[PDB]
Ligand binder design. Structure first.
Ligand SMILES: [Cl-]
Ligand SMILES: [Cl-]
Ligand SMILES: [Cl-]
Ligand SMILES: [Cl-]
Lengths: 156, 156
């Protein structure tokens, strides 16, 4: 908790120097902690509906980005916020739960899946704005730029 | 990939408006994608040693932050970058693997655990600097501040 013990972690890294700065290690630690904390907040929107983060992401991505016929698996992953083994049986599970359907693959929301997102979105949108709220307009755009810029350097 | 389709995702959110801006949703999507991509890069340091992200984090946190007697479970979680169900049997597994030991709990590196981190750290440190490399001194510190600032708002 806090920046309480960033100083402790900073001085701990300094002891490893035996005769450069700790910024990069601290910055990544902070983003990692931020990723977890953001997870917690965003989760509340849909935890009671029985969804997890991978499930909500897939549903929401279809809601915003699927055309009426749906999205194919390549497209879908390219448009979703979350990828990786974290998302292994998300489609299987959501099919199971009646919230998405297939057609010819090609995936879309069922009516129950769409009403569900429609009902949660206002709170998801509220939480999204609330977690960024400590930051101004510049700052938010700056965060945007730096993240895109870092992210660009790694996308290969 | 790219900012190629941020514009697609931005116009997709705009269609949801029926009569505010998409920044927050895009910013969080970007941090989420960044978290995954960073994961991939950092992973290479220790994937061949058989570690995963939770395992490496625990070992490294001891390396930098444990005193000679080791760290108790509260302390350890407070000093580590990663928390949550992601880290459930990390201690069990690392004990199993001979890299950490207990004593009276209280956890520390075994000699094999310490040599392992000692050997990987240079590459972990290299990767850490490399993924932040697209950004300047200001920028890195700015990212640091904004993340801490967001993270502070959520730590309760
Ligand atoms: Cl994140
Ligand atoms: Cl999204
Ligand atoms: Cl991250
Ligand atoms: Cl660390």
């Amino acid at each position: 908790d806090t920046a309480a013990l960033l100083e402790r972690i900073r001085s701990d890294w300094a002891r490893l120097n035996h005769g450069p700065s700790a910024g990069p290690m601290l910055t990544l630690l902070l983003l990692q902690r931020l990723h977890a904390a953001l997870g917690r907040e965003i989760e509340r929107t849909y935890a009671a509906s029985g969804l997890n983060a991978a499930g909500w992401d897939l549903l929401l991505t279809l809601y915003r980005s699927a055309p009426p016929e749906g999205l194919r698996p390549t497209e879908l992953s390219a448009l979703a916020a979350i990828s990786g083994p974290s998302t292994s049986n998300r489609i299987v599970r959501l099919l199971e739960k009646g919230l998405i359907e297939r057609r010819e693959a090609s995936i879309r929301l069922t009516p129950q899946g769409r009403a569900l997102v429609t009902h949660l979105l206002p709170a998801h949108l509220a939480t999204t704005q609330r977690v960024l709220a400590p930051l101004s307009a510049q700052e938010q755009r700056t965060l945007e730029e730096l993240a895109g810029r870092m992210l660009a350097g790694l996308e290969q």
